[PDB]
Amino acid sequence: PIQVIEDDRNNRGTEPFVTGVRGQVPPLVTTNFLVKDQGNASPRYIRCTSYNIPCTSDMAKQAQVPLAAVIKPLARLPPEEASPYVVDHGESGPLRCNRCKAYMCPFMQFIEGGRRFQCCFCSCINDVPPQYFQHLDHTGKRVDAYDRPELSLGSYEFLATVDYCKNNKFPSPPAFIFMIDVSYNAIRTGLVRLLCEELKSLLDFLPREGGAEESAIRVGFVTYNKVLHFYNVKSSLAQPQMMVVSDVADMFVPLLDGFLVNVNESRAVITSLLDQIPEMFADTRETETVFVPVIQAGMEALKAAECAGKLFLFHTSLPIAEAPGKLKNRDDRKLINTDKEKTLFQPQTGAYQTLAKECVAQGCCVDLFLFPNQYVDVATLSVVPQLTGGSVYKYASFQVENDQERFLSDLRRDVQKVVGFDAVMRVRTSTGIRAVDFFGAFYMSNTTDVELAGLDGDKTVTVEFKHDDRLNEESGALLQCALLYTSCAGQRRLRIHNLALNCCTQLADLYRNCETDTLINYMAKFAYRGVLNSPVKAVRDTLITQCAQILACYRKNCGQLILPECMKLLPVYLNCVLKSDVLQPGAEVTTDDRAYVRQLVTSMDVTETNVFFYPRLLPLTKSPVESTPPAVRASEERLSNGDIYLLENGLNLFLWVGASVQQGVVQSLFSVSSFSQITSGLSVLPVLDNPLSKKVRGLIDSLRAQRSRYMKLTVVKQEDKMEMLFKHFLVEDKSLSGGASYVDFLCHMHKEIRQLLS
Ligand SMILES: [Zn+2]
């Protein structure tokens, strides 16, 4: 299993995946492939747990297989894959179903000489405006192509009319506000200096759109400790002017129309400001800081400017300054295996959710960079980022000497990201099913609108659907995700993703077309949310049962272990989820760590959750065939004492060195002559001019290139220390936290399915 599974697909799907077939199961996430649209949404935008949906609710209940979709609206595409075409229908905007409001797509059935079309989602009959399509041919675009995006491709965009904007008025360009903690803790490590210096260069790479040479995103700057410092950087100043706001609680942040400026025009003053900030706070002794007020100020600033935007916070410590949102050092580890453990993943106060809502109403997305030395209550501090569609980064015990690269890498990528603003997503389906649950980083007021203050190409929204009525095996089950958003240039657009699935009446067709990784992605996210309101033990029980039942049901619908072919890895992956820190934390696992990873997994795509739960293990030494490495099962049992291995879970990279490793290898890789001299915990390989060093360093570069976040490297020597913590990534083995081992987990699952049928 695992190793061979990914290799089977790897050999049976290296050609292009063309999305022209209805419920076609895409290649495995562990397989490299090229996608050619042609009708269905590419798997990079949407992946389902099931590609051949049961036609009725009774049939579905017979299998107990959750029907879910993991959606990534603005997924970043490989260079070779075409981005969505933008269709401009002028003032009338895109044609939509008069009843269910689904947008014109490749599935709409035209009838009666094309004067009308039957809606594929609800079957309502709709008139076709006489100039609807001809309009596309009279804009300054080339018209030689036969196909029209909205009628032939799974994914495309529409320019939106004013009817799709707040106050029936087109939006203005969004803005970025950098908010820096200049308390003693932040200044002493050199973080402030590092950040200010980088910004001098980074602000020139703000997101740009259609050939725009200059970004239209204006910037604002704010520093803070227990008070906030707003800076005026109007282009006609040679020096930045500071306006302090000491009144926290009652706030009040005045205009100061020198806030939010074009980076090119204020280049000199901005540069001066970034030279000043570190100097100005150099001798500070302030240790207490605020948090909520910072987010309130930045958000209020965007509101005053009547534009949406993002706030980038750089925080170092538990906010214990007297002020709205003040927190306590509640990290109580005796609360863990109890009925009140959920309290550690919940925010301390309700001021956060309340503030998150205000942000969403204003199209304000917040990104949080944490650099903690002690408990800082990540769970609570990441509430606004999460409900706002933002991201959270953590650098425990931050130190320039060890984290400059990783942090600068994350920062640069985060600021340069393609991003959407003040957005909303809705998923329409063919009559018979409807979206019933949503998971991810977002906000929901009602039961249908997935509100996204901010959005980028790494975040995913997972949707669960349940039967409403009956589906036809001939009509299939259609899905249409519609994203309404404002771009980095201030343009309002809609992005549509259509995915057509099959409908089946024979249970055997349901079992042949499920996708395990996607199921795991769903199940994991379901469990990770459950931890907020249920004892961990119950959440784990629920997870085990979901899997036990689908397996038992398969047994009675269709002794030895029996599983459909496409679910041969469900058991193994299920054991990995149960053994993750969020559900079975080791003795050294921190509460902030759990909260942090929990938030991360809630927004992960199927690719990330696959490698997060089942890390990739690559043997390095012995087969030096230049170009031609194949991964190994995650077990200490596959670890040879005379070899070296690289392991990655999408967040951390480990280089494991066997104690019996060859001397030449150690020389060529670490530049020391014996295994004993290798530095335990080394986080950067020296640059040595030899084939083995070049190859390993390159491998590290290409692995880092395929993960959204910069993975820290840790060299692990075989005998002592960090060796034990590394054990946790050999997921098929027994863990000290009372993990089971795959084999024993199977035996147990086998008996669990027995108790359901006995
Ligand atoms: Zn309709």
22 CA distance to ligand 1 middle (Å):
19
425 CA distance to ligand 1 middle (Å):
17
Other CB atoms within 10 A of residue 92 CB: 11
Q: Domain 615-733 classified CATH 3.40.20.10?
A: yes
434 CA distance to ligand 1 middle (Å):
13
DSSP structural state of residue 28:
P
Is 196 a known ligand-binding residue?
A: no
The answer for 98, left when phi > 0, alpha when psi is -120 to 50, beta otherwise, is: alpha
40 CA distance to ligand 1 middle (Å):
19
What's the topology of domain 1-9+504-614+734-758? Answer: Four Helix Bundle (Hemerythrin (Met), subunit A) (1.20.120)
CA–CA distance from 28 to each of 12, 43, 502, 571 (Å)? 10, 10, 19, 17
* Annotated resolution, angstroms: 2.3
Q: Which amino acid is at 43?
A: P
CA–CA distance from 207 to each of 214, 268, 411, 415 (Å)? 9, 21, 14, 8
Q: Where are the alpha helices (DSSP H) in 191-308?
A: 191-202, 267-281, 292-304
509 CA distance to ligand 1 middle (Å):
27
23 CA distance to ligand 1 middle (Å):
21
Element (H, E) at 87: strand 85-87
Name the CATH superfamily housing domain 29-40+84-153.
Answer: Zn-finger domain of Sec23/24 (2.30.30.380)
- Phi, psi angle pair for 499, to nearest 5°: -135, 125
126 CA distance to ligand 1 middle (Å):
9
127 CA distance to ligand 1 middle (Å):
12
Closest Cα partner for 206 from 214, 197, 194?
214
Classify domain 41-83+154-161+418-503 at the CATH class level.
mainly beta
The three-class DSSP label of residue 60 is: helix
The CB-based long-range contact list for 247-256 (8 Å cut-off, 24+ gap) reads: 248/290, 248/293, 248/321, 248/322, 248/323, 248/324, 249/293, 249/323, 249/324, 251/293, 251/296, 251/297, 251/300, 253/228, 253/297, 253/300, 253/301, 253/304, 255/304, 256/230, 256/232
100 CA distance to ligand 1 middle (Å):
4
Distance from C-alpha of 523 to C-alpha of 517, rounded to nearest angstrom? 10
Inter-residue contact 208 to 251 (CB < 8 Å)? no
Is 100 a known ligand-binding residue?
A: yes
106 CA distance to ligand 1 middle (Å):
14
How far out from the chain centre does Cα 463 lie? 15
341 CA distance to ligand 1 middle (Å):
46
Inter-residue contact 443 to 356 (CB < 8 Å)? yes
96 CA distance to ligand 1 middle (Å):
8
Distance from C-alpha of 547 to C-alpha of 536, rounded to nearest angstrom? 17
424 CA distance to ligand 1 middle (Å):
20
Q: Is 518 exposed, middle or buried (0-12, 13-18, 19+ CB in 10 A)?
A: buried
Element (H, E) at 392: strand 392-394
482 CA distance to ligand 1 middle (Å):
14
What's the topology of domain 173-417? Answer: Rossmann fold (3.40.50)
CA–CA distance from 472 to each of 49, 111, 479 (Å)? 20, 20, 15
255 CA distance to ligand 1 middle (Å):
47
Question: Domain map of the chain by residue range?
Answer: 1-9+504-614+734-758, 29-40+84-153, 41-83+154-161+418-503, 173-417, 615-733
431 CA distance to ligand 1 middle (Å):
9
Distance from C-alpha of 131 to C-alpha of 151, rounded to nearest angstrom? 15
Breaks in the chain (C to N over 2.5 Å), named by the residue before each, are 558, 628
Task: Scan for tokens 């009956």, then name that residue.
Answer: 470
Is 122 a known ligand-binding residue?
A: yes
17 CA distance to ligand 1 middle (Å):
29
113 CA distance to ligand 1 middle (Å):
20
103 CA distance to ligand 1 middle (Å):
8
Tokens of 432: 């018979």
472 CA distance to ligand 1 middle (Å):
16
Is 97 a known ligand-binding residue?
A: yes
469 CA distance to ligand 1 middle (Å):
15
Inter-residue contact 68 to 462 (CB < 8 Å)? yes
Closest Cα partner for 342 from 594, 518, 569?
594
